[PDB]
Design a protein around this nucleic acid. Sequence first.
DNA 1: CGCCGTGTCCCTCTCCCTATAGGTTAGACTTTAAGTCAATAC
Length: 49
Amino acid sequence: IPRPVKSSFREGLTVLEYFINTHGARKGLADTALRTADSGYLTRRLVDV
DNA sequence: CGCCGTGTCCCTCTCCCTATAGGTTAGACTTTAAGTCAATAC
């Protein structure tokens, strides 16, 4: 996002900067959740082989 | 005229009432194993 956020968490974010941060936060959380299953399947296949 | 590669698509796997005939059980009668007492001997 080319804006970008220009406030630290000590100064306190504005409304739009926080709303922009929420994108990446939720994306990372969901990506981690799917990465667990990916790692599990890789482990199972390598164990079988 | 006669056969072979490439492409697309489909599919699969993963994360009512009546009438007859026959079998079943429940219920009571007489018999039997069972619980009981009284006298006795060592």
